[PDB]
């Protein structure tokens, strides 16, 4: 539940945040928030990909199910470059 | 750099029905997506902090960046997870 | 394109190329 989320490595999240050219200091709170955000994001992304998995009559979720979902949901537009 | 794929797989499998299956290539892809989710929020929060010559990205910055970029629905759950966490 | 995201997406493209 939330405990699944507690298992997410905060250091890994801090390291990603620190790739950003304008980030020196980061509050402790930030990676924690991202940990949970990561969970909500992944869940909705996959639910939405799953729709396309099933429309295609498969029980296996594939990179193109993700790609279709990114295009049908305006909230996933920032992913356009990630999943061509 | 990315979150462990084991972690990502377990969240994805909770999302789908028991019966279902996830191809490794779909897990690697969600891996990449998550890193980009983080960088994209961070980038927004960070550009804001620089404009007001602020040297730390705080949790409020992130939460406001989400709101602004159309992840407003994430805000109450994140806040509550924070409360709960450091309660 | 999501109007809320658009400007941030254009910037991020610049950041990733670098
Ligand atoms: Na769109």
Molecular structure report:
- The complex is a heterotrimer of chains A (84), B (87) and C (18).
- Chain A has helices at residues 2-6, 10-17, 29-55, 63-72; strands at 25-26, 60-61.
- Chain A is mostly helical.
- Chain A has one domain (1-84): Histone, subunit A, CATH 1.10.20.
- Chain A starts with a helix and ends in a 12-residue tail after the last helix.
- The longest helix of chain B has 28 residues, at 24-51.
- Chain B has 87 residues and is mostly helical.
- By secondary structure, chain C is an all-alpha fold.
- The chains are: A mainly alpha (84), B mainly alpha (87), C mainly alpha (18).
- Chains A and B meet through helix 1, helix 2, strand 1, helix 3 and strand 2 of A and helix 1, strand 1, helix 2, strand 2 and helix 3 of B.
- Strand 2 (60-61) of chain A pairs parallel with strand 1 (21-22) of chain B, so a sheet runs across the interface.
- Bound molecules: sodium ion (NA).
- Residues 74, 77 of chain A line the site of sodium ion (NA).
- The PDB classes it as transcription.
Q: C-alpha Rg of chain A, in Å?
A: 15 Å
Oligomer: heterotrimer
Task: Give the total of beta strands of chain A.
Answer: 2
The main sheet of chain A comes to: none
Number of domains of chain A: 1
The CATH class label of chain A is Mainly Alpha
What class, by secondary structure content of chain B? mainly alpha
Give keywords.
B: 87 residues; mainly alpha; Histone, subunit A; globular; C: 18 residues; 83% helix; elongated; Nuclear transcription factor Y subunit beta (chain B); Nuclear transcription factor Y subunit gamma (chain A)
């Amino acid at each position: 539940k939330d405990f699944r989320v507690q298992e997410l490595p905060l250091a890994r999240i801090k390291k990603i945040m620190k790739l950003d050219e304008d980030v020196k200091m980061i509050s402790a709170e930030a990676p924690v928030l991202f940990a949970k955000a990561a969970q909500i994001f992944i869940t909705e992304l996959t639910l939405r990909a799953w729709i396309h998995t099933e429309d295609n009559k498969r029980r296996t979720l594939q990179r193109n199910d993700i790609a279709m979902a990114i295009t049908k949901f305006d909230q996933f537009d920032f992913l356009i470059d990630i999943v061509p | 750099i990315y979150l462990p794929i084991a972690n990502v797989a377990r969240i994805m499998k909770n999302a789908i029905p028991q019966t279902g299956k996830i191809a490794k290539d779909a897990k690697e892809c969600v891996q990449e997506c998550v890193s980009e989710f983080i960088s994209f929020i961070t980038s927004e929060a960070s550009e804001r902090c620089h404009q007001e010559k602020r040297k730390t990205i705080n949790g409020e910055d992130i939460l406001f960046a989400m709101s602004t970029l159309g992840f407003d629905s994430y805000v109450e759950p994140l806040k509550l997870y924070l409360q709960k966490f450091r309660e | 394109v999501n109007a809320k995201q658009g400007h941030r997406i254009x910037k991020r493209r610049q950041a990733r190329a670098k």
